[PDB]
Structures are given as structure tokens and as C-alpha cells.
Design a protein around this ligand. Structure first.
Ligand SMILES: [K+]
Ligand SMILES: [K+]
Ligand SMILES: [Mg+2]
Ligand SMILES: [Mg+2]
Ligand SMILES: [Mg+2]
Ligand SMILES: [Mg+2]
Ligand SMILES: [Mg+2]
Ligand SMILES: [Mg+2]
Ligand SMILES: [Mg+2]
Ligand SMILES: [Mg+2]
Ligand SMILES: [Mg+2]
Ligand SMILES: [Mg+2]
Ligand SMILES: [Mg+2]
Ligand SMILES: [Mg+2]
Ligand SMILES: [Mg+2]
Lengths: 158, 353, 193, 98, 52
RNA sequence: GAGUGCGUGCAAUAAGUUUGCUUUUCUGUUAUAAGUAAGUAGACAUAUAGGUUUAGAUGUUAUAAUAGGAUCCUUCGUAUG
RNA sequence: GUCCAAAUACUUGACACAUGCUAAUCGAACGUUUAAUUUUGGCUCUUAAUUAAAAGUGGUGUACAGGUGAGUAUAAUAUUUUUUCGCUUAACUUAAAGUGAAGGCAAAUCCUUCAUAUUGCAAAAGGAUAUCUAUAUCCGCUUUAAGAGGAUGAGAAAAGUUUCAGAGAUAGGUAGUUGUUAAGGUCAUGGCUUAACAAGCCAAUAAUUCUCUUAGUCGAAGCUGAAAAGGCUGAUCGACCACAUUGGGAAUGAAAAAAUCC
């Protein structure tokens, strides 16, 4: 009820080639294919694009063919994830850390997000409880004075 | 709007000292702009005000304002107003109340609830009823509100006493009757006299100040002393016109005033409890004070009303007088000898004089 | 169809009507020979007589239709009017033993309020009793304690046209600036002589 | 403040109005949110009719007009009258009988 | 209004007007939405039919 | 030789303005201090009276801490050279 | 060169301007004054009022309408389509609840503060008109839940679109800048924010920056061609941008969106 689940939607799959790797942790530059239409010449031009794909377990090396999927937003400039390796480079696929399935990656977001809310409800209650105690002490010092000053008057009427 | 408060008529040296004190520190600062008033009382600007003290263009020669220690320099207003009040012994002295009470109204000094009743007693016993009726008229300036049930009962007493002082002569009785109505008109219409204190006292009596049997009996007294003299026709037009009011006010007082209820039983028993609300009536010295003319009125009214052929009113009014006379007699024995109450009642009701 | 409403005691003739609604309409009082001519003539017939400008003619046609509907202005429901001057008085009642009700009633100047009966004791709308002996209401000049009168003043019913204070909200700082220059030039001039 | 008002179009001495849904504080002839209908003040006469009667042709989308009135649209004095004749609102002015 | 659901008559001349205007906007909103909903259902039905 | 509504460097700079090992100041609560000025409470007594007297529960005044907002200085900054 | 209707009418010096007008309105927000009118008091002066005009204080509106094309050279947190959303204390619709106490100015529905408002923080303002032989209405104010509207949050994600003036020069640009871990923030997402590490990210044919010349932009809106994603114009029409003598700036406000203000 209070937890927000990720979309968990499957987008298209693109086949590309890793251009760079090992420069930044859990990130590689993949080059996919594209094509743009020139309305003036009525001609299609090749429009190759290079994105920053999310390699969770650092299982990609420059030169391997991979299949990526968009919609997986991990950072400001990272909107793509690695789905699987089409053709490895250097070493076989069995000698690299496994690529987590999209379900495992999504579960990490839900688990991490759900845990984040559990910390807030505790921090909010403790913050509200630790403050109500101080506000409850002002009543004490203010109540003893009234009870000490109001009973005095009442003690001279009976 | 109004001229700056100033006192330039003091018969005694002590009176001037009490007014000059309040005037130069409690009244005058009320004429300065708000920012300058705060500066006067600030310790940080003490040295600055010494070199170049604030000034005021007051009818010529200017005043000066140095630093005023709010705790030590400021004088006790209730005490000074007392010293000035007691010292007042000449008409020129009492004329300062118009400026004094105006200054406190500007300073927002919540004066003692009973103070008004005191000014009306000391000023009227000296023969200055007009100064009171003049301030009671100019309440927008002086702040002489008729909020207390004692002030109204005290003011109406001296009004009648002045008429009775000269055997209830027609020239003065017409003037007194004019004043009693000018007050009952203010209590009803004028809003300056309505405050939280009044609403509380009107709730304890269940009779507004303008429909209180104790006060309506004052008007009925003078009206009863006008038909008595006559009951040339240019004067008879008034006599025949006064008989209509007498029978009118009489039947109005009998309706409000319950049956066989004296002055101490008229209002709710819970009214005489609080000392700030209608407790003065308990003391026999003060009861006979406000029960002298109120009793004589019913007696004379029941007599005149009886000659015109009004059986019911004749019996009704006598019922009240019988109830007040019985209670009044109890006060004569309880009151201490030599008290003002025992004297006035002896001179009005007893007629010993 | 163009019904004519009967004249009221407060508006007996046309010269009175055109005087109340103001806007300099008392100039064309002679154009209307009778009281029916006012409520019978049309726009075209009011234009040939010389009822100009168009604002005054349209303003008259409005108050003309406003009179048929009994939507009079102030003091339009009076009955005891004498030569264009009415008198107001207070009628005190007894709503309760501790209260009084005061209503501003219109009676002849001589008769007393208590003497008048309910039928002829009219209660004027728009005037109220302040205090105990004050008659508050537009165009209520006091004569005695609890007595006032309504003199038929020009423009008593008129809808005042708005006016510009000192040349409007746009040309205000300029008009006052130029007045000061003219004022200063005439104080300095007298100094020369 | 949405309003159902008229936008004057046409030529000199040939008025033709357009019922529109526009914000109060906008130009009279600016492009509104919608065009509910049209209004022609000059009454016409049937072609082959000699009775002398006259009619005023008005095109109005009653369905669209009702929705805007239900959300708080304020029709002007002229459009209020038209809507009253159709039966959507109550007349604002009536001929005094007395 | 609570006073209307309780079957109470209008208090003043102005209350009667507010009651009529408020009800006019209620019936207009109902007939408006429904009347416009059928247009949508009728429009997209013609599109899907012609396109199919 | 004449002109410049152009760009730019330094100096200077009104309104305005970043920052703080600045300078005053107001307000807000928090904890105290006072009860003389005010204001709010209680006790006793007086009588053509309304006086004496103690008290801080709201509130007033003062200090301290603390939060925040305006001033001064600082930095930047049209004109101008 | 006879008559009539409609439609257009400073394309140049955003050159300088005589004169009258384009934003005012509410007395059912508020008192100040001046006049008469009526009341006091003391014997013309002096109190308390009523009334009418004239200046104002306040509330709302000048953020709309109308005018102009000087400046301005663009790819942008720009824009459509689908999915998912968020905010909105003014005004417009529906309803509910609350509308009490002081001080300052001459007074106030103006300012300052307070009590109360599911728990705990957090509001308000009064005015006016009838009835009776105090009661109930009317116009407001504050708060709250919704609808509509909106110039709304950098909304987000996926897939797309935008003919970017002409000439010359410049190879670096980016420093929360790019990514990871952890935490906060957010409806959600994003260095959005911070700590600690890593040295990345965009670009290489000009990304980026600089100088000069010229220009308001667009639309079957106008003109034109048989036609081209045609060409030209950017008057009247509608949308957008900028400006109000030139330059340099801020606040108020729901929102600058002013011919305002400094
Ligand atoms: K410099
Ligand atoms: K331009
Ligand atoms: Mg190819
Ligand atoms: Mg410098
Ligand atoms: Mg500076
Ligand atoms: Mg003291
Ligand atoms: Mg220094
Ligand atoms: Mg310079
Ligand atoms: Mg031009
Ligand atoms: Mg504009
Ligand atoms: Mg109130
Ligand atoms: Mg798609
Ligand atoms: Mg950034
Ligand atoms: Mg140009
Ligand atoms: Mg243009």
C-alpha cells in the first residue's frame, strides 16, 4: 500500500558493439544501429548512436556484441541495460560474471526502495516521539507552577 | 482634534504637583509619534536624548523629553490621581478632571472600576454636577463611561438631591428631569457606555441600566414632584402633560419591579456576591443612600395616582414602598451612628432635617 | 400599452420629477405640456423637442420606465407631503418589557405621532432611528428631537456620473506639477511688483 | 473565468456573432477554446411565406453548452437569454406585469 | 445543501435563486457528460468499424 | 581629420547585490530575574469611604541562550574617465 | 473622372510633439475635514449630532484591451503521440465548518499580535436591511473537501519531429562536470542535494567560442506557378516573441503576464 513498485515493462531489444570498457565502474559505451530520413533528398542516412549501458557485474569487454534494452534508468545519462551477450570478445561467456536477469535487477530496486521507506517511518516516529517528550516536559514545569499557585488560593476559601 | 491637555488653575500647591507629574510623563508622551515614544523609554538612546532631547510644540513654549526609566521614573497613576482628587476644593480645580481623565484615556490606563463613582461623589457634594454631566456627555474624549451600576445610581442620587435641596422648585425640577433623561438616553442609545463589565452586571440583574427599577424610580420621583405643584394655562399644559408621563412611567415601573421585592431582593441573589458587581447595596450606610428618594417617590406617586382614580397602581406602588420601607427600617438599626446613610434617610424620609 | 402611472404625493408634477433625477433635465421642463406627455412621447418625439444630448434622453427614458415599476428613489413612498417638504418622526413601540422599537414614520407636521392611526402612519423605507432620538438617512435634515424633513433637492435621485479628480489616474502627476509651476510663478510675480 | 459570450464578426451594418467559450479577460475576437454556435441578430423571413412572420436562425450545440454551464461557465446577459429560451437556465429579466 | 436534503423551504429571495441556479448546473452537467460520452462512443465505433 | 547606439582592459560607480575571523537592531519562542511603571490575581480593613498589603499563574520589563528578518561594512555593479 | 456599397489606408525618421481624451470603480469598508440644520453648556464663544458636497485612506482592477517591429540568428530542461503523474492559499462553479480579544494612525473589511480550529503546528473582518404588542436574513471574510481552468514540475518513460540567415575564424569543451557505493529528497525519476572514491563525460569533418552584415517568427494569411517538403512577402486576419526615451535593477502577487515601481 505504501510501497511503490517499479513498472517492470519490457521494451525493444537492440544489438550493438561495446566501444569502451573498464573506464568507469558498471558502465560501457555500446554502439547500436540507426537510420534517419532526409525529407529534402527523400533518402535514408545511417544514424549510429552510442549510449552508456549499465553493466551490473562488469561482465563486458571492449569488442563483444551485446543485446541492450532501454527504459532502465540507472543514472543521469544511463537509460539502457544489458540483456545478454551475443558474441563475446577475448574469453568465453563462461569465464565472466553472470548477467543478472531483468527480474533480479528490478527486485533490487523494489527491495532497496521498500527498505528506504522503513527507515523514514522509524526516523519520523522517533523524531516526533523525541520531540513530544520535550514538549511534554514544558507541561510539567508549567503544570506544577499552576497547581502550586492555584491550590494556594483554594486553600483560603474553605 | 482636541486641544492639548493643560492644567492652569490650581488653588493648592500639592494639586499642581500631582497633575504636572502625570502630565509631563503619562499624558504628554501620548501626543508624540509612535516611533518617538518608544525611543524615550529606551536605554540605548539615553545619551543621545541628553544632547538633543525631543521637543513638542505645545501652545507656544515647547516641552522636552529626556530618557525615562520605565520602572523607576514613571509615577504611580492611581496614587497621583488620588492626591489630585482629594486636594480639589474649588470649581477651577475640578475643571481639570476633563483634561485628567482625557489624558488617561489616551494613555490606555485601565483605571479602577470604582474611580468613576468616587469622582461623581466628591465633585457633586461640592456643587459641580455640570462638570460630571459634561464629561458624561463627552465620553468620546474623557472616557467617563457609565459602565458601573454604582456610578449611575450615584449620579442619579445627587441629581435628585439638588432638586430636593430647594423644596423641589419647578425651575430646577424641570432641569433635573431633563438631566435624568439625558442619561437614560445614553445608556440605551450611546454605545460608548457599553463594555464587557456592563454586560456582566446587566446579566446579574436581568434589567438593562435603562430599564432598571432603581433608576426608573428617579425619573418617576421628579415627575411626581411636578404634578404635585399643579394638578396661565400655558403652565397647565405642562401639568396635564406631566400626568400622562406619571401614569405612563408608573405602570412601566410596576411591570418591571416584581411584587413585594425590596431593593436587596430585586436582582438575582448572585449579584450581591461579587464585590465588583452590586455589593455596595449590602452595607446599610449605602442602602439608605439610594433608598431614600426611591422610597419617597413611590409614596408620592401612589398618592397622586390615587387621586386620579387608579386603584391597581395605587395598590401596586404601595406594595413596593411597603417592601422597601420594611427593608429600609432594618438598615436604620443596623447602620452605625453618624454615618452618611443614617443622616440622608433621616432628612429625606424621616423629614427631621 | 404605454401606461401612465398616477403622480405620487412626492412627485406631483413633471417639474418635480425632472428636478429629482437631476442631470440638468429641468431645462426641458416646458417641452412636456402635461404629465401624460412625459410617459407617452417616444424617443423620436423626445429628439425633435430638443431633449439632448442622447445621454440625457436615454437617461430620462430609463427613469421613465423606472417610475412605472414603482422603483422610486429616496422618499418616493411618502404620502403627507406639503409643498414639496415632508416631515419624519419616530414611532416608539413596546416589543418587550426591557426593549423599545423605533420606526421612522411620515406624518403631518402638526399632528403628533401617537395621535395618528395605523392607516395614515406610513413607514418610510431607507431611514432608521439611531440612538433614541436621531433619524439617520439620506437627505434627513433635523428640525427637533426626533423630527426631520426631506426637502426636494435637485439631483436627489440622480445617478451621479463619475468625475476625474485631477485629470485622471494617468494625467495626475503632470496636472498637479503644472499647477505648482503656475502657482509659484504668481507668488514670485507679486514679489517683483 | 470561463464565459459563454458572443464574438462579433461580419461587415459594416451586417453583424454576425459567434458563440464561444473564452476566458473573461481576453480580446473579443481572439481564438477561443471552442465555438459553440453562431447567432444572427437580423431576423429573416421564409422564402415562400407571405404571413409576414420573422425568425432568427441560431445554431447552438446544446450538449457542449450544458457541460460548460455545469462547471462554472458564466454566460453574458445576451447568451443567458438565448439559453433560457432553449430551457437551460432561468430568465434573468421578465416584463413586470403590474 | 443540507437544508435542501432535509426538505426545508427557501429562507430568502436570494436562497430560492441559488437553489434554481445550482440545480440548473446539476442537470446541465449530467446531460452534458452523458450527451458528450455517447458522441465519443459513437465516434470511435465508426472509426474502428471503417478501419477494420 | 571627423564621428560612434560597437567590442574589450583597468579605475570608478547609483539602484541592487554573493559571502561572513563584519556593525547595530527588531521580533519569536526557551530558561531565569524583578514586582518600583504598568497589567493580572488573592488577603485584611475603611464609610459623604474606596485604603492598606502580598503574590506571579496569563501578561509587562530586563538579562542570557537560541531561531529568523531587517540595517552597516565587505564583494560585484549603469553613468563616467 | 458620374453615382453607390464593402474592404484597405506612414511600407520612410523606435523622428520631435501644441491641445482634448484611451482606467476607472465601490458611501452596503473607513473616518477626516468645510458648509448649512438641529442640540449642549456657559453667557458671538463652546459640546454632541444629522446632512450634502470636496479631498483622501482602503478593496478590486490598470497582469485585460490597444500600439509598435527598434532589438533579437535559432537544436532547446524546445516540441507532438501513447502510458503514468504531480502542483494549484486569488477569481469562476458545489457543499461543509468557523467567523471570537487587544493595540497603532483621525478611523477602518488598513497595519501589529493573540485565543480557538480531528492528535500538533497552522486562520479570520466586519458591514448592511427587516420583524416584534431579542430573533431571523442579506453582502463578505477564514479554513477545508471537490469540479473546471492554468502561464502548472526540470514532470517522468518509450518512439519520433523541428529546410538551424549569410560570410570569416577558432580543437577543444565540460568541473557536480561523467560513473560507482552509501544516505537524504521526490508521487516518481534525475549530483536534484551531500559524503567518500574513481577520471571520466561530449566532441574530433567546428562540439564549443568569437567578430562582422542582415532580419520580428509562422500559417493555402496575402501574391504567384501546370507542378516541386514550389517561390516571394511577413500589410490588413489569427498564433508566438520582444519593446514602451536609452541603459542598469528589484519587489509585490495564485501567477509579471505592467504604458507600474527603484
Ligand atoms: K574593473
Ligand atoms: K524587429
Ligand atoms: Mg545504405
Ligand atoms: Mg569598487
Ligand atoms: Mg552598496
Ligand atoms: Mg507598581
Ligand atoms: Mg575590512
Ligand atoms: Mg563602464
Ligand atoms: Mg512605421
Ligand atoms: Mg498588456
Ligand atoms: Mg465580529
Ligand atoms: Mg512509437
Ligand atoms: Mg547538473
Ligand atoms: Mg530591424
Ligand atoms: Mg506583424
Amino acid at each position: 500500500a505504501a510501497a511503490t513498485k517499479v513498472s517492470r515493462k519490457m521494451f525493444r531489444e537492440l544489438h550493438g558493439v561495446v566501444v569502451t570498457s573498464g573506464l568507469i565502474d558498471k558502465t560501457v559505451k555500446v554502439r547500436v544501429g540507426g537510420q534517419k530520413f532526409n525529407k529534402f533528398l527523400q533518402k535514408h542516412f545511417d544514424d549510429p548512436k552510442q549510449y552508456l549501458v549499465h553493466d551490473p557485474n562488469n561482465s563486458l569487454r571492449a569488442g563483444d556484441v551485446v543485446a541492450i534494452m532501454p527504459g532502465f534508468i540507472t543514472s543521469k545519462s544511463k537509460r539502457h541495460v544489458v540483456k545478454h551477450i551475443i558474441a563475446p570478445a577475448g574469453t568465453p561467456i563462461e569465464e565472466r560474471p553472470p548477467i543478472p536477469s531483468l527480474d533480479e535487477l528490478w527486485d533490487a530496486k523494489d527491495a532497496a526502495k521498500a527498505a528506504k521507506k522503513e527507515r523514514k517511518v522509524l526516523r519520523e516516529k522517533m523524531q516526533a516521539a523525541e520531540e513530544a517528550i520535550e514538549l511534554a516536559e514544558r507541561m510539567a514545569r508549567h503544570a506544577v507552577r499552576e497547581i502550586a499557585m492555584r491550590e494556594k488560593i483554594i486553600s483560603l476559601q474553605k | 482634534t482636541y486641544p492639548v491637555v493643560s492644567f492652569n488653575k490650581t488653588s493648592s500647591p500639592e494639586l499642581k504637583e500631582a497633575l504636572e507629574t502625570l502630565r509631563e510623563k503619562v499624558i504628554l508622551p501620548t501626543y508624540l509619534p509612535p516611533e518617538l515614544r518608544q525611543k524615550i523609554f529606551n536605554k540605548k538612546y539615553e545619551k543621545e536624548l541628553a544632547h538633543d532631547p525631543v521637543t513638542i510644540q505645545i501652545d507656544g513654549q515647547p516641552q522636552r523629553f529626556s530618557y525615562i526609566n520605565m520602572l523607576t521614573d514613571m509615577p504611580n497613576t492611581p496614587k497621583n490621581i488620588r492626591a489630585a482628587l482629594l486636594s480639589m476644593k474649588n470649581g477651577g480645580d475640578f475643571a481639570n478632571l476633563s483634561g485628567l481623565l482625557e489624558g488617561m484615556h489616551r494613555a490606555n490606563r485601565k483605571l479602577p472600576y470604582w474611580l468613576s463613582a468616587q469622582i461623581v461623589r466628591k465633585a457633586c457634594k461640592a456643587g459641580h454636577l455640570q462638570l460630571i454631566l459634561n464629561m458624561v456627555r463627552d465620553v468620546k474624549r474623557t472616557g467617563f463611561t457609565l459602565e458601573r451600576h454604582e456610578t449611575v445610581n450615584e449620579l442619579l442620587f445627587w441629581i435628585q438631591r439638588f432638586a430636593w435641596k430647594s423644596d423641589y422648585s419647578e425651575p430646577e425640577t424641570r432641569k433635573a428631569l431633563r438631566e435624568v433623561q439625558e442619561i437614560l438616553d445614553a445608556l440605551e442609545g450611546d454605545e460608548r457606555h457599553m463594555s464587557k463589565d456592563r454586560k456582566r452586571q446587566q446579566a446579574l440583574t436581568r434589567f438593562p441600566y435603562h430599564r432598571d427599577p432603581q433608576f426608573l424610580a428617579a425619573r418617576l420621583n421628579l415627575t411626581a414632584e411636578l404634578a404635585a405643584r399643579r394638578a396661565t394655562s400655558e403652565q397647565q399644559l405642562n401639568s396635564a402633560n406631566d400626568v400622562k408621563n406619571l401614569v405612563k412611567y408608573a405602570e412601566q415601573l410596576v411591570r418591571l419591579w416584581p411584587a413585594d421585592k425590596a431593593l436587596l431582593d430585586m436582582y438575582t441573589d448572585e449579584a450581591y456576591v461579587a464585590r465588583v458587581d452590586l455589593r455596595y447595596l449590602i452595607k446599610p450606610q449605602v442602602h439608605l443612600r439610594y433608598a431614600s428618594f426611591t422610597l419617597q417617590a413611590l409614596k408620592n406617586a401612589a398618592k397622586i395616582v390615587g387621586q386620579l382614580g387608579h386603584g391597581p397602581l395605587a395598590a401596586q406602588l404601595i406594595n413596593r414602598a411597603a417592601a422597601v420601607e420594611a427593608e429600609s427600617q432594618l438598615a436604620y438599626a443596623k447602620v452605625d451612628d453618624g454615618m452618611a446613610g443614617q443622616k440622608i434617610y433621616e432628612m429625606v424620609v424621616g423629614g427631621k432635617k | 400599452l404605454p401606461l401612465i402611472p398616477k403622480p405620487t404625493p412626492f412627485v406631483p408634477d413633471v417639474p418635480t420629477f425632472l428636478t429629482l433625477i437631476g442631470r440638468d433635465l429641468k431645462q426641458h421642463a416646458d417641452k412636456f405640456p402635461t404629465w401624460e406627455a412625459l410617459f407617452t412621447l417616444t424617443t423620436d418625439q423626445l429628439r425633435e423637442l430638443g431633449v439632448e444630448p442622447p445621454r440625457a434622453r436615454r437617461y430620462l427614458l430609463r427613469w421613465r420606465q423606472r417610475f412605472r415599476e414603482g422603483k422610486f428613489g429616496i422618499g418616493g413612498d411618502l404620502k403627507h407631503v406639503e409643498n414639496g417638504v415632508a416631515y419624519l418622526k419616530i414611532h416608539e413601540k413596546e416589543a418587550s418589557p426591557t426593549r423599545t422599537s423605533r420606526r421612522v414614520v411620515n406624518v403631518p407636521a402638526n399632528q403628533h405621532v401617537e395621535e395618528v392611526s395605523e392607516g395614515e402612519r406610513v413607514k418610510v423605507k431607507g431611514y432608521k432611528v439611531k440612538g433614541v432620538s436621531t433619524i439617520v438617512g439620506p437627505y434627513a435634515l433635523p428640525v427637533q428631537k426626533g423630527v426631520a424633513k426631506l426637502a426636494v433637492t435637485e439631483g436627489m435621485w440622480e445617478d451621479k456620473r463619475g468625475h476625474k479628480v485631477d485629470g485622471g489616474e494617468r494625467r495626475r502627476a503632470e496636472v498637479r506639477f503644472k499647477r505648482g509651476v503656475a502657482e509659484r510663478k504668481a507668488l514670485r510675480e507679486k514679489m517683483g511688483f | 473565468v470561463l464565459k459563454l459570450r458572443l464574438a462579433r464578426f461580419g461587415r459594416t451594418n451586417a453583424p454576425f456573432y459567434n458563440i464561444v467559450v473564452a476566458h473573461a479577460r481576453t480580446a473579443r475576437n481572439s481564438k477561443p477554446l471552442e465555438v459553440i454556435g453562431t447567432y444572427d441578430p437580423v431576423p429573416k423571413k421564409d422564402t415562400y411565406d407571405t404571413t409576414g412572420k420573422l425568425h432568427k436562425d441560431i445554431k447552438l450545440d446544446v450538449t457542449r453548452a450544458k457541460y460548460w454551464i455545469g462547471v462554472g461557465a458564466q454566460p453574458t446577459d445576451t447568451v443567458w437569454r438565448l439559453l433560457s429560451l432553449v430551457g437551460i437556465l432561468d430568465p434573468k429579466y421578465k416584463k413586470p406585469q403590474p | 445543501s443540507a437544508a435542501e436534503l432535509a426538505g426545508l423551504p427557501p429562507k430568502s429571495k436570494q436562497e430560492s435563486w441559488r437553489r434554481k441556479m445550482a440545480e440548473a448546473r446539476r442537470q446541465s452537467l449530467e446531460a452534458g457528460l452523458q450527451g458528450l460520452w455517447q458522441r465519443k462512443v459513437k465516434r470511435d465505433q465508426k472509426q474502428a468499424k471503417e478501419s477494420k
